[PDB]
Structures are given as C-alpha cells and as structure tokens.
Amino acid sequence: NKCVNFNFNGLTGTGVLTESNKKFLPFQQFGRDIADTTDAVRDPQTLE
Amino acid sequence: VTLADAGFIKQYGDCLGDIAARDLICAQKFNGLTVLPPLLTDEMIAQY
Numbered sequence: 001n002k003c004v005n006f007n008f009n010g011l012t013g014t015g016v017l018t019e020s021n022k023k024f025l026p027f028q029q030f031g032r033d034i035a036d037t038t039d040a041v042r043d044p045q046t047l048e
Numbered sequence: 049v050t051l052a053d054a055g056f057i058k059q060y061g062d063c064l065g066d067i068a069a070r071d072l073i074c075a076q077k078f079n080g081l082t083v084l085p086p087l088l089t090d091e092m093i094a095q096y
C-alpha cells in the first residue's frame with residue numbers, strides 16, 4: 001500500500017504492492033497485462 | 049451511444065485489483081494516454 005522500488009528474482013520496477021484477488025496456478029510466478037508488463041507477482045518467501 | 053473514459057475523475061482506489069485486468073481504460077491510463085473532458089457538459093449542451 002506504499003510506493004517502492006521492488007525487485008522479485010531480478011524483476012526490478014516501481015509501484016505499490018497489494019494483496020491480489022488473483023489465483024495463480026502452482027507453476028506460475030508472474031502475471032501480465034495487455035501492455036506486456038508484470039502487474040501481479042508471487043512473493044518467493046511466502047507464495048502469496 | 050456507449051462511452052467509457054468520458055474524461056471524468058478516477059480515484060486511485062478503484063482500478064487496482066480485478067478492474068485493471070478487465071478494463072482497458074486504466075491500462076491506457078497507466079501508460080500516459082489521458083482522455084480529457086469536454087468544456088461543455090452534456091447538461092450545458094442540452095441547455096443550449
């Protein structure tokens with residue numbers, strides 16, 4: 001809920017992280033949108 | 049005639065979550081494409 005310079009497994013970027021309603025299948029780690037960009041990510045240390 | 053952006057106000061607390069998945073308008077907005085409102089409202093055009 002705060003603006004941060006994140007890095008998940010080398011996916012560097014800037015934004016706000018928030019608990020999603022998205023339901024990623026076990027083999028997926030990144031979710032993307034129409035503009036070809038990750039808008040959802042699985043947190044490696046907790047799998048949320 | 050259906051319309052979407054209508055150049056009217058968006059809070060920063062609606063698109064996050066499921067919306068920006070289903071709705072292209074904030075996909076466009078999250079990339080610097082901005083629809084602006086007309087100077088006359090539909091009430092002023094109807095009044096004239």
Ligand SMILES: *[C@@H]1O[C@H](CO)[C@@H](O)[C@H](O)[C@H]1NC(C)=O
Nearest residue numbers: 009042043044045046047048
């Ligand atoms: C990740 O590793 C840390 C350090 O060993 C551990 O405390 C933590 O419980 C681990 N993650 C989970 C979800 O168990």
